[PDB]
């Protein structure tokens, strides 16, 4: 019985960027893993369909960093309230284990068809 | 301590002339018709060393 | 323990479902635990033959060939396709001493 993420994750907050340049103050959303280490967000989502890099804020003072993305995969991601399209880019350089925990949490515990 | 600096330089000139007398006697022995025929068919001129006695030698010892 | 000794797979009871096209096989304790058996049993001894057939004769290679980098990257894709970590055939392009040990 090898189970993926036998304990769930939490946290959703802050922003990221859409224009490598812009990321003015509020672009897209970051998802999960405060990450014991400190802060390591596993995955990213968006209400839009245009995001090249993302200056996602982080702890300390040098929190600014280019948390860029890669070719996405979109889902219907039906909100309980109603339908809403959301394109899921993954953090550049994620490994197959983390993309398993993320997918397991936001699909099996959320309303997706 | 200066006889010993002389001794060593005289010696340094006797080994520098013995390796030279070797690397020029193990060279006049390369049938340079069968050796320039595989360094030429090589892509860049590099070949494995284990195939030089195997394809360009004249004598076999079993 | 979910692949018998013929290659057939069979416990699908701890698998989740996502949108088609994005599935993530997690193979990291399957390959790593199996690794010491891949050289004891000499698994890849049928790759020296002319059609990967244990009956047809051996491959006669060029004697002046020494690179073998395009065939090292094709052996990784045939058997270890979903092993997610960069493989450097020539370890002079590695990134630290824990990458030299992985790629060698
Ligand atoms: F792997 Be068993 F079906 F819990
Ligand atoms: Mg089982
Ligand atoms: Zn490496």
UniProtKB/Swiss-Prot annotation, chain B:
**In which compartments does the protein localize?**
Host cytoplasm, Host perinuclear region; Host cytoplasm; Host endoplasmic reticulum
Q: What does this protein do?
A: Plays a role in viral RNA synthesis. Forms a hexadecamer with nsp7 (8 subunits of each) that may participate in viral replication by acting as a primase. Alternatively, may synthesize substantially longer products than oligonucleotide primers. Interacts with ribosome signal recognition particle RNA (SRP). Together with NSP9, suppress protein integration into the cell membrane, thereby disrupting host immune defenses.
Q: How does this protein assemble?
A: Interacts with nsp7, nsp13 and nsp12 to form the replication-transcription complex (RTC): nsp12, nsp7, two subunits of nsp8, and up to two subunits of nsp13. Eight copies of nsp7 and eight copies of nsp8 assemble to form a heterohexadecamer dsRNA-encircling ring structure.
Tell me what this protein is called.
Answer: Non-structural protein 8
Q: Which organism is it from?
A: Severe acute respiratory syndrome coronavirus 2
The gene it comes from is rep
Query: Which residues of the full-length protein are shown here?
Result: 4011 to 4072 of 7096
């Amino acid at each position: 019985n090898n189970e993926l993420s036998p304990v769930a994750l939490r946290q959703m907050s802050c922003a990221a960027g859409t224009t490598q340049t812009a990321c003015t103050d509020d672009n897209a959303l970051a998802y999960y893993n405060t990450t014991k280490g400190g802060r390591f967000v596993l995955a990213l989502l968006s209400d839009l369909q245009d995001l090249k890099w993302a200056r996602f804020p982080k702890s300390d003072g040098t929190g600014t960093i280019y948390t860029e993305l890669e070719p996405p995969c979109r889902f219907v991601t039906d909100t309980p309230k109603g339908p809403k399209v959301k394109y899921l880019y993954f953090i550049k350089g994620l490994n197959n284990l983390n993309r398993g925990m993320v997918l397991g949490s936001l699909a099996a515990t959320v309303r997706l068809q | 301590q200066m006889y010993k600096q002389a001794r060593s330089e005289d010696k340094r000139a006797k080994v520098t002339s013995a390796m030279q007398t070797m690397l020029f006697t193990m060279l006049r022995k390369l049938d340079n018709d069968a050796l320039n025929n595989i360094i030429n068919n090589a892509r860049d001129g590099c070949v494995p060393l284990n195939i030089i006695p195997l394809t360009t030698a004249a004598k076999l010892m079993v | 323990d979910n692949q018998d000794l013929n290659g057939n797979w069979y416990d699908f009871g701890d698998f989740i479902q996502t949108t088609p096209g994005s599935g993530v096989p997690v193979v990291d304790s399957y390959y790593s635990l199996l690794m010491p058996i891949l050289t004891l049993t000499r698994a890849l001894t049928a790759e020296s033959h002319v059609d990967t057939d244990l009956t047809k004769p051996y491959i006669k290679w060029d004697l002046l060939k020494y690179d073998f980098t395009e065939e090292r990257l094709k052996l990784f894709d045939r058997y270890f396709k979903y092993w997610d970590q960069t493989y450097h055939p020539n370890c002079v392009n590695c990134l630290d001493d824990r990458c030299i040990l992985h790629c060698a």
